[PDB]
Enzyme design. Sequence first.
Site, PDB file in Angstrom:
ATOM      1  CG  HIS A  92       3.332  10.139  -0.390  1.00  0.00           C
ATOM      2  ND1 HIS A  92       3.457   9.060  -1.217  1.00  0.00           N
ATOM      3  CD2 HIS A  92       2.036  10.191  -0.041  1.00  0.00           C
ATOM      4  CE1 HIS A  92       2.272   8.450  -1.321  1.00  0.00           C
ATOM      5  NE2 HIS A  92       1.403   9.118  -0.589  1.00  0.00           N
ATOM      6  CG  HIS A  94      -1.898  11.973   2.056  1.00  0.00           C
ATOM      7  ND1 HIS A  94      -2.282  12.396   0.812  1.00  0.00           N
ATOM      8  CD2 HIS A  94      -1.354  10.760   1.883  1.00  0.00           C
ATOM      9  CE1 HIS A  94      -1.978  11.476  -0.093  1.00  0.00           C
ATOM     10  NE2 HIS A  94      -1.361  10.489   0.533  1.00  0.00           N
ATOM     11  CD  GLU A 104      -4.932  10.374   1.382  1.00  0.00           C
ATOM     12  OE1 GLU A 104      -4.298   9.401   0.939  1.00  0.00           O
ATOM     13  OE2 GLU A 104      -5.426  11.253   0.673  1.00  0.00           O
ATOM     14  CG  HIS A 117      -0.001   6.745   2.087  1.00  0.00           C
ATOM     15  ND1 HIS A 117      -0.883   7.535   1.389  1.00  0.00           N
ATOM     16  CD2 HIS A 117      -0.690   6.279   3.142  1.00  0.00           C
ATOM     17  CE1 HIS A 117      -2.071   7.519   1.956  1.00  0.00           C
ATOM     18  NE2 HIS A 117      -1.999   6.776   3.047  1.00  0.00           N
ATOM     19  CB  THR A 196      -5.596   8.274  -1.680  1.00  0.00           C
ATOM     20  OG1 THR A 196      -4.247   8.757  -1.666  1.00  0.00           O
ATOM     21  CG2 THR A 196      -5.844   6.967  -0.873  1.00  0.00           C
TER      22      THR A 196
HETATM   23  O1  LIG Z   1      -2.217   6.120  -1.592  1.00  0.00           O
HETATM   24  C1  LIG Z   1      -1.791   7.019  -2.244  1.00  0.00           C
HETATM   25  N1  LIG Z   1      -1.133   8.142  -1.979  1.00  0.00           N
HETATM   26  C2  LIG Z   1      -0.962   8.782  -3.165  1.00  0.00           C
HETATM   27  O2  LIG Z   1      -0.421   9.893  -3.262  1.00  0.00           O
HETATM   28  C3  LIG Z   1      -1.524   7.989  -4.341  1.00  0.00           C
HETATM   29  C4  LIG Z   1      -0.414   7.616  -5.272  1.00  0.00           C
HETATM   30  C5  LIG Z   1      -0.333   8.170  -6.529  1.00  0.00           C
HETATM   31  C6  LIG Z   1       0.718   7.844  -7.390  1.00  0.00           C
HETATM   32  C7  LIG Z   1       1.664   6.915  -6.958  1.00  0.00           C
HETATM   33  C8  LIG Z   1       1.582   6.365  -5.725  1.00  0.00           C
HETATM   34  C9  LIG Z   1       0.573   6.673  -4.860  1.00  0.00           C
HETATM   35  O3  LIG Z   1      -2.110   6.875  -3.620  1.00  0.00           O
HETATM   36 ZN   LIG Z   2      -0.583   8.760  -0.250  1.00  0.00          ZN
END
Ligand SMILES: O=C1NC(=O)[C@@H](c2ccccc2)O1
Ligand SMILES: [Zn+2]
Length: 258
Positions: A92, A94, A104, A117, A196
């Site tokens: 995904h 950010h 981030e 990520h 995060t």
């Molecule tokens: O680094 C991250 N990005 C996110 O959205 C968070 C995360 C939350 C839940 C599962 C996997 C990752 O941790």
């Molecule tokens: Zn993330």
Amino acid sequence: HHWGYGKHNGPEHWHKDFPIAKGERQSPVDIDTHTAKYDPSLKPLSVSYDQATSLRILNNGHAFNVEFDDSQDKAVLKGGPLDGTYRLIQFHFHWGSLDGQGSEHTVDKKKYAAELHLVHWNTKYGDFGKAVQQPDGLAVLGIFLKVGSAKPGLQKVVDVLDSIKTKGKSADFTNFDPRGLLPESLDYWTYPGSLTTPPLLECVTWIVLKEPISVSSEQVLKFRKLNFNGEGEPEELMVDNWRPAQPLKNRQIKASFK
Ligand SMILES: O=C1NC(=O)[C@@H](c2ccccc2)O1
Ligand SMILES: [Zn+2]
């Protein structure tokens, strides 16, 4: 839990439901390039994505996730700081409301437009839910995005976004090759950290690539047309879905490169 990124439910509030928000190994962090030390014993990084099987793309109200089949070792990360085999489960991003913010992690306090990520879990724990309860459960590969030339390998993602505008919407997303999202170099920084977002679990080995990928302004603009809300609710654009830098505390950031 009604966490998000707004004034009333954003990162400064998380700690009340999730007290680990103020813990000792939170992420993201600023990467100070003059303090990070080259670590000659880091083994080479191995990104083995040739057999990846993407399945679905989901707007979860926080970001959009490209999910993979992680029922076998199809797409794995190994080497670098890692012991053993980590399986790709989802990626995904950010991103920001403007090109000057979104990432981030920061580099010498520089914010990038976005950050990718690629989330992997340690196969010795059997499933993702078990892995996030362990200090070495996850390995998150982080890749910065800057605005410049278009990334061709991203465009399949950008074109499906219209079909998942609102929270809870998903679309079939087969045959997507995550190799198309990597930069040329695998030079990285690494440090022990956390998720995060809530639940903020301190279960991650962070591997942050030094070289950003370039995406076009048109590409990132399409990310910013997503919605945090569900269908038929007041429109809240999915922008500025990033947590700011957290205290480094007692940690060292290692570099794979001189
Ligand atoms: O680094 C991250 N990005 C996110 O959205 C968070 C995360 C939350 C839940 C599962 C996997 C990752 O941790
Ligand atoms: Zn993330």
